[PDB]
Each structure stands twice: as C-alpha cells, then as structure tokens.
Short mmCIF file of N, CA and C in Angstrom, two decimals:
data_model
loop_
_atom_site.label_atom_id
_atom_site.label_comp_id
_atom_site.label_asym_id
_atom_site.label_seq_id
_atom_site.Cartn_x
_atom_site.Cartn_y
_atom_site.Cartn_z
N UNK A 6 36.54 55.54 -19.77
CA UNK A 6 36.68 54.23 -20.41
C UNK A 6 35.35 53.47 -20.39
N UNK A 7 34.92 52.50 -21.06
CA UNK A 7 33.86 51.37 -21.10
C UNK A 7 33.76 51.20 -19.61
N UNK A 8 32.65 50.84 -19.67
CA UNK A 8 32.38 50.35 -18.66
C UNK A 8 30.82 48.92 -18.39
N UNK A 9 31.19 47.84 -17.77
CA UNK A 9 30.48 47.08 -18.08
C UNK A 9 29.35 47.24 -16.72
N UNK A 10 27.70 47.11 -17.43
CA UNK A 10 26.81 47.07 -16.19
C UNK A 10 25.76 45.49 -16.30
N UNK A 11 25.05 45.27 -15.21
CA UNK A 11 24.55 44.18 -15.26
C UNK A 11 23.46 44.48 -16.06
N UNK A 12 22.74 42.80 -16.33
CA UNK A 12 21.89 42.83 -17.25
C UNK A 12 21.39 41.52 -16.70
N UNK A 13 19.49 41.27 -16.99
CA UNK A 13 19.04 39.71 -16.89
C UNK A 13 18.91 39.28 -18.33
N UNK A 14 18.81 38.25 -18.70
CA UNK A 14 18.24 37.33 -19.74
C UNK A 14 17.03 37.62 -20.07
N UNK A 15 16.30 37.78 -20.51
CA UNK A 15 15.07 37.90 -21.33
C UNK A 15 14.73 36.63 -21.92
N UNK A 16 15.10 36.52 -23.67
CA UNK A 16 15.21 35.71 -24.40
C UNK A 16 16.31 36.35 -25.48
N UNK A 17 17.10 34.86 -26.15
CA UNK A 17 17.62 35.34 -27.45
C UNK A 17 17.03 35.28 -28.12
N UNK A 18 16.64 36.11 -29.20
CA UNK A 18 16.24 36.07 -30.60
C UNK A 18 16.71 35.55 -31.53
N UNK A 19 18.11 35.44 -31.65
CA UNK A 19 18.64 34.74 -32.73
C UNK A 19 20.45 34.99 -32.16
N UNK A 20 21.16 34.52 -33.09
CA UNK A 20 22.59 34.87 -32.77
C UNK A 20 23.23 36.19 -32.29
N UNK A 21 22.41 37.50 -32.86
CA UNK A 21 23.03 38.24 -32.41
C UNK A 21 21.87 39.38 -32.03
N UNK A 22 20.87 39.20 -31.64
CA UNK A 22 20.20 39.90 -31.31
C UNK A 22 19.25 39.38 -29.79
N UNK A 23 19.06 40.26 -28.94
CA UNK A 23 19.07 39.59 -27.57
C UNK A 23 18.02 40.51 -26.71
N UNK A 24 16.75 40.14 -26.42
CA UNK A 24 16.18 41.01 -25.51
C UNK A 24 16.74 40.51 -23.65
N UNK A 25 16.95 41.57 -23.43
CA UNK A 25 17.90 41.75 -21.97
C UNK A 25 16.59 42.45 -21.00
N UNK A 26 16.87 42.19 -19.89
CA UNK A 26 15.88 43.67 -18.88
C UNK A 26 17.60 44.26 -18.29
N UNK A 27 17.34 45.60 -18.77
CA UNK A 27 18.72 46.35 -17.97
C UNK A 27 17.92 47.25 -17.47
N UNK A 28 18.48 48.28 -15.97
CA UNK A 28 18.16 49.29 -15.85
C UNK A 28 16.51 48.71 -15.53
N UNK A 29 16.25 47.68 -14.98
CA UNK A 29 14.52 47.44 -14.81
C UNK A 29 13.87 47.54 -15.73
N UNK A 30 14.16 47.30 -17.11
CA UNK A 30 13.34 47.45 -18.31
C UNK A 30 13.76 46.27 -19.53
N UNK A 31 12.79 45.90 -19.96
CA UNK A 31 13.00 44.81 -21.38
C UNK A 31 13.27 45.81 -22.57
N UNK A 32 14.46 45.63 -22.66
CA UNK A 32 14.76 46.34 -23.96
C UNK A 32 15.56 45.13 -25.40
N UNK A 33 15.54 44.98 -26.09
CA UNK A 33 16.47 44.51 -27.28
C UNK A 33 17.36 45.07 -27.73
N UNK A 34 18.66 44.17 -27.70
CA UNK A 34 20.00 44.72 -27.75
C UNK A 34 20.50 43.48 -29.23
N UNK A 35 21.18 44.23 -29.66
CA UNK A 35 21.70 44.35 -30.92
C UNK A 35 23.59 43.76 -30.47
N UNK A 36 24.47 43.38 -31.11
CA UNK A 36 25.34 42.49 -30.79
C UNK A 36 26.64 43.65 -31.51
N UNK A 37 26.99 44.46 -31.22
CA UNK A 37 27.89 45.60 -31.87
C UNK A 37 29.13 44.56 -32.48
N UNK A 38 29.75 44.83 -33.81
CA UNK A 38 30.74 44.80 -34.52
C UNK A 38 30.65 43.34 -35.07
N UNK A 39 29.44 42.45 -34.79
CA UNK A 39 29.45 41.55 -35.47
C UNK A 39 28.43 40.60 -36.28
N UNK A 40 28.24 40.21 -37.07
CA UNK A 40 26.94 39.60 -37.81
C UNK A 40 26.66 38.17 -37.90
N UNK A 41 25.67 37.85 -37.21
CA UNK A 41 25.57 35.89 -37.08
C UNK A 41 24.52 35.91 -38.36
N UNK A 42 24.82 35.06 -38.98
CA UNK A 42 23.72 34.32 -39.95
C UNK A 42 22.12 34.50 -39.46
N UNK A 43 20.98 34.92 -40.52
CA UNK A 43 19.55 34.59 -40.24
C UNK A 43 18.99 33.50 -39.76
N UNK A 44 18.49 33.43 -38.94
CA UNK A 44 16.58 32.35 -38.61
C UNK A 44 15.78 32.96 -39.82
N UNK A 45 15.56 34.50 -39.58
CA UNK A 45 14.20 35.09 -39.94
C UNK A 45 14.19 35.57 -40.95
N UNK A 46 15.35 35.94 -41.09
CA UNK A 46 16.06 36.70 -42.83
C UNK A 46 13.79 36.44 -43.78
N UNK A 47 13.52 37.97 -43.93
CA UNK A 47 12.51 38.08 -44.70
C UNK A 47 12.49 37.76 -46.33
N UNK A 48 13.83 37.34 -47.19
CA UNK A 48 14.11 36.79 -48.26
C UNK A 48 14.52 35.38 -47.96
N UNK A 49 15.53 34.78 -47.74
CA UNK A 49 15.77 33.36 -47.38
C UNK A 49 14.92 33.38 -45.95
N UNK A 50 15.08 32.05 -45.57
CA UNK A 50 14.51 31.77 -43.83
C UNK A 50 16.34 31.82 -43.46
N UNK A 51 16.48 30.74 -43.24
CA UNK A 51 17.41 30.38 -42.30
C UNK A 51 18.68 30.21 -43.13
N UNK A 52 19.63 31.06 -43.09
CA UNK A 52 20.98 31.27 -43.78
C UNK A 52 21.94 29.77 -42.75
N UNK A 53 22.95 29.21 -43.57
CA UNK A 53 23.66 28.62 -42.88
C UNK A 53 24.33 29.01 -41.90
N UNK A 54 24.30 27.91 -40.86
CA UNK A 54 24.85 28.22 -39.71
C UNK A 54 24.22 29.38 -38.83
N UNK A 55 22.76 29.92 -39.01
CA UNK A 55 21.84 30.70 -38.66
C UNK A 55 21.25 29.64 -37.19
N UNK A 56 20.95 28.57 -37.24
CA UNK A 56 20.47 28.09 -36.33
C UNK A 56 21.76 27.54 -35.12
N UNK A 57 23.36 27.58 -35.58
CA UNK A 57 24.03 27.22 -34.89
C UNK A 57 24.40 28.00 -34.17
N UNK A 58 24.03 29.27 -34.64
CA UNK A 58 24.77 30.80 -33.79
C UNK A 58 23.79 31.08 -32.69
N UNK A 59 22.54 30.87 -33.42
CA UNK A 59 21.24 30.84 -32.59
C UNK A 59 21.41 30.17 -31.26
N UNK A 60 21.30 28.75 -31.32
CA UNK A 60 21.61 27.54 -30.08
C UNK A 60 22.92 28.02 -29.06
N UNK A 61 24.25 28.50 -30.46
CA UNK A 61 25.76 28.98 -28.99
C UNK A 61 25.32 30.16 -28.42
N UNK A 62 24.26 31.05 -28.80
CA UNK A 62 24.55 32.25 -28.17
C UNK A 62 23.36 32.00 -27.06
N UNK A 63 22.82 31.49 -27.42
CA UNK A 63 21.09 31.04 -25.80
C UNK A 63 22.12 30.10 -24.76
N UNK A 64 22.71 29.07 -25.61
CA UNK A 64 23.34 28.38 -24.42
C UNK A 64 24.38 28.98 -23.48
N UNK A 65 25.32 30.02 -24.21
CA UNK A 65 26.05 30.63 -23.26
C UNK A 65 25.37 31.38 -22.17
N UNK A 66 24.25 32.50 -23.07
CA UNK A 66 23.91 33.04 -22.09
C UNK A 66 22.98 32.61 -21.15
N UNK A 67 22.32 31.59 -21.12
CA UNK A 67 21.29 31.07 -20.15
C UNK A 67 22.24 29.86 -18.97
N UNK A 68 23.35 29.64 -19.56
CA UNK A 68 23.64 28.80 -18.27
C UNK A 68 24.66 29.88 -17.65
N UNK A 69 24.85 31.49 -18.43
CA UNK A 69 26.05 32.21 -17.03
C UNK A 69 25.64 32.57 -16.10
N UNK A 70 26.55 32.70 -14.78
CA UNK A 70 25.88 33.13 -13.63
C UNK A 70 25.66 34.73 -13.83
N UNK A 71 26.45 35.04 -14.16
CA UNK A 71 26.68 36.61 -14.76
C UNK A 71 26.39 37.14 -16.35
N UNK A 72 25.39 38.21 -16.42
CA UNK A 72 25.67 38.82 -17.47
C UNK A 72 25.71 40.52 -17.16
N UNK A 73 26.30 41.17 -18.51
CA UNK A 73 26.87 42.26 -18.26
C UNK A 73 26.58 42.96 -19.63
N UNK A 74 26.20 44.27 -19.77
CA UNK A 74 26.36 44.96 -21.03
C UNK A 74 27.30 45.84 -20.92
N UNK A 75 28.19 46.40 -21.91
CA UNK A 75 29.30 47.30 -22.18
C UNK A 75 28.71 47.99 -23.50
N UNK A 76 28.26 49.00 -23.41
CA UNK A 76 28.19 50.16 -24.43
C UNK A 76 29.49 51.22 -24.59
N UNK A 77 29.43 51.11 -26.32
CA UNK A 77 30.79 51.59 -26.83
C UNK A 77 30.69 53.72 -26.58
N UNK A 78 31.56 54.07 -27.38
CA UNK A 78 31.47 55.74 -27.02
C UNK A 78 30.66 56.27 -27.87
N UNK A 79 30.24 55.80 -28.72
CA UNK A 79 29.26 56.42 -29.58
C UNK A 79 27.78 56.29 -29.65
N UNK A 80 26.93 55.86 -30.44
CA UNK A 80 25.66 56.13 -30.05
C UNK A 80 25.20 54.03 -29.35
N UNK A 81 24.71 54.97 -28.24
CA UNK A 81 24.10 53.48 -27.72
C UNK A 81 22.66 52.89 -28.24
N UNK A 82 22.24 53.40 -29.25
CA UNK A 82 20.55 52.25 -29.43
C UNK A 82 20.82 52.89 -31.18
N UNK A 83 20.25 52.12 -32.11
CA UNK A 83 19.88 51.86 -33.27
C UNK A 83 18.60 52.62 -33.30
N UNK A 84 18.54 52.52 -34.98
CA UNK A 84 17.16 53.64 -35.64
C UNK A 84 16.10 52.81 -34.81
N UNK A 85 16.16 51.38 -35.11
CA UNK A 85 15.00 50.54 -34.62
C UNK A 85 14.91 50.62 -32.67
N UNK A 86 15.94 51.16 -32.42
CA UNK A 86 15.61 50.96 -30.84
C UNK A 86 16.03 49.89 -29.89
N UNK A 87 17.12 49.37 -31.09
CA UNK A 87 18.09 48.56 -29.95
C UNK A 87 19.17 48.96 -29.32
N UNK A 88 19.39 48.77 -28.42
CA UNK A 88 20.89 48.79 -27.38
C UNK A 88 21.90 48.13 -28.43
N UNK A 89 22.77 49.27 -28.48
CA UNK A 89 24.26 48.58 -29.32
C UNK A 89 25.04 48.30 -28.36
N UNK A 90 25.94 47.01 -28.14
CA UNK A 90 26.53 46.88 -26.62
C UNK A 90 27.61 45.55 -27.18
N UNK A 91 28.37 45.11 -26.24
CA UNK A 91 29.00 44.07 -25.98
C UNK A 91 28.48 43.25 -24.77
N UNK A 92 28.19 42.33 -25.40
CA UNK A 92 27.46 41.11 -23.91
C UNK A 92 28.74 40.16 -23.43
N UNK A 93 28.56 40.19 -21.91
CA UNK A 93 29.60 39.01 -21.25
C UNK A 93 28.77 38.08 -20.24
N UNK A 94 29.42 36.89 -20.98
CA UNK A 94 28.87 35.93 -19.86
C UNK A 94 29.65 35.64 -18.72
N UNK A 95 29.53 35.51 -17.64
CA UNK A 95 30.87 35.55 -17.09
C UNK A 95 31.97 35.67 -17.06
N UNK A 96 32.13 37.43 -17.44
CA UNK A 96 33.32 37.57 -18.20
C UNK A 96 34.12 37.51 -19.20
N UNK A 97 33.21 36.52 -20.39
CA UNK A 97 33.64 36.41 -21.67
C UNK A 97 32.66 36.68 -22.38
N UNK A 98 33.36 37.80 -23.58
CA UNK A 98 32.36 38.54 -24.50
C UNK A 98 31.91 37.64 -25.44
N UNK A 99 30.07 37.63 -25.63
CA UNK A 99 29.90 37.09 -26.20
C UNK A 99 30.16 36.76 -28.25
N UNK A 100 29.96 38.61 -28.05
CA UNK A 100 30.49 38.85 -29.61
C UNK A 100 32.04 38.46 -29.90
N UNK A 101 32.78 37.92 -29.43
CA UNK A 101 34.24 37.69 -29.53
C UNK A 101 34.17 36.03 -29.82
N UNK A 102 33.33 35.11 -28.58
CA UNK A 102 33.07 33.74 -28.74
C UNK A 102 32.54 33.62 -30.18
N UNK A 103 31.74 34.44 -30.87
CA UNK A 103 30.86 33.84 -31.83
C UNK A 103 31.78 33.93 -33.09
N UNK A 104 32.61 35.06 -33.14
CA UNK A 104 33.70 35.47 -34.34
C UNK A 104 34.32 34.07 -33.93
N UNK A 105 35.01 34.12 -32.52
CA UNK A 105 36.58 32.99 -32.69
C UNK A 105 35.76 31.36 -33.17
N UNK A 106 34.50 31.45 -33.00
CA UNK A 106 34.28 29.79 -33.58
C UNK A 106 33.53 29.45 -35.14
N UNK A 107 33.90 31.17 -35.52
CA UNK A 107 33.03 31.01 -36.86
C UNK A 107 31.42 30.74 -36.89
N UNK A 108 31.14 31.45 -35.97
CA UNK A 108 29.69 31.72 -36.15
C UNK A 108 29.26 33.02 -36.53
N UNK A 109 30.20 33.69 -36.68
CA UNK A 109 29.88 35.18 -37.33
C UNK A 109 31.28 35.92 -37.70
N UNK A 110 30.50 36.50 -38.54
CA UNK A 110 31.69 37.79 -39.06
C UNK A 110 31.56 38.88 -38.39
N UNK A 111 32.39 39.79 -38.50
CA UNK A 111 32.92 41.07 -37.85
C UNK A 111 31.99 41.77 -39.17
N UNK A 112 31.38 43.07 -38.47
CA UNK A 112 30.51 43.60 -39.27
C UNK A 112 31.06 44.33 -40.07
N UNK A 113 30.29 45.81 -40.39
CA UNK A 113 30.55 46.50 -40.64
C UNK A 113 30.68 47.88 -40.07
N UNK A 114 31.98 48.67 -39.82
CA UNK A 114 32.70 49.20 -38.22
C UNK A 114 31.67 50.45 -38.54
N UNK A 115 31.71 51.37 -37.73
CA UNK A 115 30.79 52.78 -37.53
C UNK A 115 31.30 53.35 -36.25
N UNK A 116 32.44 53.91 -36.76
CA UNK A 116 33.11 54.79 -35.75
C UNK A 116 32.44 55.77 -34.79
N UNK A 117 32.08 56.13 -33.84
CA UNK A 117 33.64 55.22 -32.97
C UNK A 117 33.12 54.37 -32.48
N UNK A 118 31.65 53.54 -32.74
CA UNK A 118 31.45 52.07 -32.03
C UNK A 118 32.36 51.36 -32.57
N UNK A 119 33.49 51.65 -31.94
CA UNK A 119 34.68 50.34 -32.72
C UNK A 119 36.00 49.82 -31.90
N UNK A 120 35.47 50.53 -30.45
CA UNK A 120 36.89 50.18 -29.40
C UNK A 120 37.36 48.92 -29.22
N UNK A 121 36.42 47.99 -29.65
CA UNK A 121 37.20 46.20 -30.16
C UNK A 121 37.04 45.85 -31.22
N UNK A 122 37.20 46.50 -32.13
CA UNK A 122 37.47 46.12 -33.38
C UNK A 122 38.48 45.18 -33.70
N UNK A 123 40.06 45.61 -33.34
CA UNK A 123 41.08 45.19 -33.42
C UNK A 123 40.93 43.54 -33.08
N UNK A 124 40.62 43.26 -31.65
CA UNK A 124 40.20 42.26 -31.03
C UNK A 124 39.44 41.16 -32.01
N UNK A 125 38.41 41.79 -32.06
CA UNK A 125 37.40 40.88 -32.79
C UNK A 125 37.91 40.55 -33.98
N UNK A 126 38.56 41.17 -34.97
CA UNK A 126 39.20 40.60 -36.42
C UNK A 126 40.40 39.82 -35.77
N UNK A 127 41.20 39.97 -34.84
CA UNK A 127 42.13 38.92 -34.85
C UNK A 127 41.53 37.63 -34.50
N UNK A 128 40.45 37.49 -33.81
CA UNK A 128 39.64 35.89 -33.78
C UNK A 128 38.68 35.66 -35.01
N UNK A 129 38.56 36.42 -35.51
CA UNK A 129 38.02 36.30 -36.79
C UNK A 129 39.09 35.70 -37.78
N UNK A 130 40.12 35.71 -37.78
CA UNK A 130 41.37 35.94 -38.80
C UNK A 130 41.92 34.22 -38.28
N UNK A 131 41.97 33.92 -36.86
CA UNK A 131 42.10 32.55 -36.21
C UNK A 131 41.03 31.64 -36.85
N UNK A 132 39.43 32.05 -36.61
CA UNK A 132 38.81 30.84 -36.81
C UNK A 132 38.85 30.84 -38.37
N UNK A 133 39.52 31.76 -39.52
CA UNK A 133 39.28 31.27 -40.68
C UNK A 133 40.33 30.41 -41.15
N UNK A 134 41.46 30.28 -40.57
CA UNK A 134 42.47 29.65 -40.38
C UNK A 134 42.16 28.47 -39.86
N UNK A 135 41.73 28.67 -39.27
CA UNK A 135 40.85 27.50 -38.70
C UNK A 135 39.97 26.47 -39.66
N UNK A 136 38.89 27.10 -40.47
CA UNK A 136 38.49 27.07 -41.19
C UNK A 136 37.33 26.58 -40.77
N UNK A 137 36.58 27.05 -39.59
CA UNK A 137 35.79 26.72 -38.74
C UNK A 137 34.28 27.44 -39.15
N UNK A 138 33.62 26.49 -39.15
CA UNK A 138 32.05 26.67 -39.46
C UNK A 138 31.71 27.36 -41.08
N UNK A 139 31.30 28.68 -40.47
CA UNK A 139 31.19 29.74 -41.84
C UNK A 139 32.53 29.98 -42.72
N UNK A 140 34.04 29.93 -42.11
CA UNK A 140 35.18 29.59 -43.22
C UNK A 140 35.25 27.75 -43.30
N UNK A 141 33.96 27.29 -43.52
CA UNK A 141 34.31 25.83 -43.25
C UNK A 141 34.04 25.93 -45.01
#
C-alpha cells in the first residue's frame, strides 16, 4: 500500500509545484492528479486564481508542523525530473485542500498514478457546487 515519508519545505513555486529536501536532497515535486492555475504560464503570466493557489499552498505548507510525501504505484518523477507525490500537511493532503476550495482542477489521470482519484473528484464535484473560486 502507499505509504507516506517525511519531507522539509524548501520553497513553493507556485500552486502545485513544490521544491521539498526528501531523502537529504532538494528535489522538485510536482502535485499528482491535480492542476492549480499559472504565475509563470510562458504564453499568459498569471492565469486567474494563479496567485491564490500560489499564497494557499505556501501558507499551508510553511505554517505545518509536519510534512509528508506519498508516492503513487506507478512512476515516481516526471520527464522533467520531478517527484510525482501527494503532499500532507499535518495530515491533510494538500492536493485534496486545493480541489475542495476551487483552487484547482483534478488533472488529467495516468494510470495507475490514480489511487485518489475517486477522492479528489468528489471535492472537486463539492466545491463546484459550491461554486467556489475557479467554478465561481
């Protein structure tokens, strides 16, 4: 089964992309099954709600006492060399917070990185009901 290991803070990069030191090393980790709006986007700058995903995802993770990475069963790092993972801040995933408040969508799945899939579209499916932020 998954299994979650520790991780420090680095810096966030943006909503869903996150340099971590795991394992004694600075690596950049990538936010599996879900997509926050651009800062850097090389055609537009800053997509809406790009700077709000930005600010919830630094603030969660810089004030938890705990963070944690969970890599899915399939491949763990990207062409570019990021860690594909699920981040928790004390226990709560960060990619799940950012879907349930409408700061991001649920990506696009790539089996079998997809063991919360299910999860993540049902808070996805809440905050549009919601009609919160990006379903605003």
């Amino acid at each position: 089964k998954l299994h979650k290991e520790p991780a420090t803070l680095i810096k966030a990069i943006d909503g869903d992309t996150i340099k971590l030191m795991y394992k004694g090393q600075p690596m950049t980790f990538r936010l599996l099954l879900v997509d926050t709006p651009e800062t850097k986007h090389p055609k537009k700058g800053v997509e809406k709600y790009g700077p709000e995903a930005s600010a919830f995802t630094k603030k969660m993770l810089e004030n938890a006492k705990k963070l944690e990475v969970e890599f899915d069963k399939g491949q763990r790092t990207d062409k570019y060399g990021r860690g594909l993972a699920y981040l928790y801040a004390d226990g709560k995933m960060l990619n799940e917070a950012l879907v349930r408040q409408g700061l991001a969508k649920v990506a696009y799945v790539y089996k079998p990185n997809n063991t919360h899939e299910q999860h993540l579209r049902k808070s996805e499916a809440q905050a549009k009901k919601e009609k919160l932020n990006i379903w605003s």
